[PDB]
Amino acid sequence: YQDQEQRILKFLEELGEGKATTAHDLSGKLGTPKKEIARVLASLAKKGKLQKEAGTPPLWKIA
């Protein structure tokens, strides 16, 4: 998608392609609100391409 996607994509690849990340890192770099990152995360996962590790390890996942 527009820059919106180009950003999130470059974010994960900026730390490590094929890995996971945390909100503190997302809202920190992207400078976006936790409400936004949390929305797109659940919205993208709708297709099954996104993932969110909701357990012991506080962080999301990749699909």
Closest C-alpha to 59, from 26, 18, 35, 32? 26
Residue 15 and residue 60: Cα distance in Å, rounded? 14
Residue 40 and residue 45: Cα distance in Å, rounded? 8
Residue 40 and residue 4: Cα distance in Å, rounded? 10
Residues in contact with 14: Cβ distance below 8 Å, sequence separation at least 6, in sequence order: 29
Residue type, position 2, single letter: Q
Residue 27 and residue 50: Cα distance in Å, rounded? 17
Residue 5 and residue 13: Cα distance in Å, rounded? 12
Look-up: residue for tokens 């995360």? 41
Residue 3 and residue 5: Cα distance in Å, rounded? 5
Fold adopted by 1-63: Arc Repressor Mutant, subunit A (1.10.10)
